[PDB]
Symmetry: D4
Subunit: 121 residues, 8 copies
């Protein structure tokens, strides 16, 4: 099964970061979410009740990104991946990629980040 | 076999959407189509009759995207995937990705959408 | 083995095309080439003689793209893939993607094209 | 395991190159690094000590890119891949892609380069 | 007075062109329209009746761009500039820029075109 | 005097619009602000007290963009221009450009909008 | 009179440059040409004979850019500006901007260059 | 006289900023420099000695951007504008634009900054 629902380039301004000054000033976090969900039924029925609504998924990402400040991007992605899977049974697997295009790193780069893939148990 | 014919960034203005106001105002839908087709013969013969003409494929996508308003992107992709496979035997598999870069979701994101992969039976 | 040498976004102005007017006016063709080549030796020795020089590969693509006008993109890719493999033994496999970002198709799209993968026998 | 930490679009100005004039004038080198690292622990603990800090990884890439001039991009990638793996046990595999968007090649292209994948033994 | 209403990056697929083959195959035309209109009243009243509605202006551009095939971009811009001014008194001046990003010119360029500025008499 | 302080590409999600459905669903509004302010003193003294702090200016734009829903972009720009000038004496003139890159207009365009220039009396 | 005909983002690979190694290896030169030409007649008549054909202008730029190697960008622009004006009476003024997005300068920048404006005497 | 020499998109990582944490972590500063310089002589002679070499100008910007940390962007631009004019007589006027695409401002914007124009006395 290779069907997916996606949310790309989601951006939030938070204060997460392993550096004290990071959490003090904050920055923009770019988030990419890809869910593994069978869309044949919804494709045939045309009923949003037979799929996973993205608007709702965006709410879950937002609430986590713009919530309490944590240290690692790994923790935010793990909280997002765990939150989506717990709420949606149709999501067989969740993949979260978070990017800090402007971290406290003296250099020239397009961005840094992490990406995790979490199956729905 | 890893050969493919593709149509990327196709854009249509339609009125599909699970919200009444969506179908009232409409928006731009971005569509990506990738077909699994062996191109050795056409590669050797140079005869467009030995491959699948994209211009025609674009017609099938257009007619569906700019046709009656449905509810889900899943339904549009399913109608496109089913329509291409029914018409072309050389297409061993069809993959449709539809993106709503500007849905009724209060946030900042590059876009949301779905992607399905349908084999040709 | 997942090492590769690549040439991306190569652009040539040619007159290939299944339409008579296409070959009359011409257009820009964008080409992407990816070769499967083991780079450990060259990585250790630092000797360009232990790898496949891209400058030369670009010559082979250019000569084919800016050569006689054929009909299908499939034929150009097949001529490129066959030409690279015949000349380089270190290339275990060749992948050619050609894009016509502006074909004779009345619509809005980022481009259309094909992609082939040819192993080196 | 599909988790990864990444550094994209890193750019350095060096004098590497198989041509004498290349090393004389120099140019910009774009580098992409992707590490295979399990992030569950760090995802649960939120402790940067349970993951691989990118800032440090960027230091290793920088020191190599802006260090002595070598001949091949293959040598730089091999030195980077070998250096990251030797220092971090949590990195199960390292992938380095280096791009010369402006080499001594008379043509129009977005760039040329190589990419290697090195497992951590 | 430096207030303006604008429509940028409007794109239409037409068959205009000084070459017979151009009008046969067609291409995409990008259009930029900038109108000189005092927006204080509308800025104070908030009444769309005190300004020039862009949706309507887009209709006038569309009808002309996707209408009969002419020869010069100069003629299309002149027809657009003359049509907007005749219909709207609040438009003190009209500026039309049309771009053919892909004309029958064997070369590499971002595009070619013209731009005219027509006062409303 | 040609000195300026600027805020470019500011984006807010609001519900302004001359159409009932517009205000119901909302959309993203892109805002560009350019202030005419002499920066010699601040350039010599290095004292943020001798210039106009952008962070504060962004607050004024935000509060207006994400405030009550009005009808015209002209009204939002007029409220922004009037609000900045009233608060800052050093701003000799304010210029506001607002863009609706995705309005209720069935077509292909990069965006539509307005731009006003208001001197500080 | 504010009418203009333009050629943007023209790119040529040449060997011009004040450094010996520059002329040895070469690089891409980006050229922007803007001509001041009254387009009312051509706008009314629709006769390409009443305007300045860009295809021809592109030929003049190309022949100069891809011709003998000079030292300064100033010399190339001066040769282009002088060549266009000498050939076309309808061009009341010529403006040439040349950019070296990748010169022999150790740093990070989008590009460097010059721009000249030459009236037609 | 409308001739100019330019340096666009220059980027440096510094620690300037009115906030203590800003100077602690640092960020990327984008700089645009435009000099008013007559290029006819250099255009005729082709002698780099008859113009202002950009490589040198880039050195002056770099040394200032990557030098001691100041508070305001206004101070950096004023130091750059004053430094260029003092060293080059042919520069009749200097214009410096500095952008902080990622300041300590909780929002979504492409960037903020200032721009000054300083004549050479
Ligand atoms: C300096 C702040 O660093 C981080 O937040 C961080 C570093 N490395 C990794 N892997 N994750 C992080 O969140
Ligand atoms: C509010 C409209 O929503 C949709 O159209 C929609 C939502 N979720 C999914 N998965 N598909 C849709 O088409
Ligand atoms: C109208 C010209 O069409 C083509 O050249 C063409 C169409 N389809 C495919 N698959 N390849 C082509 O080259
Ligand atoms: C002319 C310089 O060429 C190179 O540096 C080079 C060429 N080919 C490959 N595969 N690697 C290189 O580094
Ligand atoms: C070959 C087609 O050319 C044109 O259409 C054309 C050329 N030059 C100018 N100035 N305008 C045109 O429309
Ligand atoms: C359909 C909504 O239209 C508008 O909001 C609108 C139209 N025209 C102008 N000039 N301004 C607007 O805000
Ligand atoms: C090192 C090569 O430099 C140049 O070619 C050059 C430098 N400065 C100016 N103003 N023009 C040039 O062409
Ligand atoms: C919070 C840091 O702010 C600044 O550095 C700053 C603010 N406003 C202006 N006009 N210039 C600055 O440098």
């Amino acid at each position: 099964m290779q069907d997916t629902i996606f949310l790309k380039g989601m951006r939030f301004y938070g204060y997460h970061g392993a550096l004290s000054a990071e959490n003090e000033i904050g920055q923009i976090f770019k988030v990419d979410v890809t869910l593994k969900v069978d869309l044949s039924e919804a494709g045939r029925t045309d009923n949003v009740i037979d799929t996973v609504h993205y608007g709702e998924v965006f709410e879950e990402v937002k609430s986590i990104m713009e919530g309490k400040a944590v240290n690692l991007l790994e923790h935010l992605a793990e909280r997002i991946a765990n939150r989506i899977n717990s709420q949606y049974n149709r999501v067989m697997e969740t993949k979260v990629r978070i990017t800090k295009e402007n971290p406290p790193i003296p250099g020239h780069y397009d961005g840094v980040g992490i990406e995790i893939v979490r199956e729905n148990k």
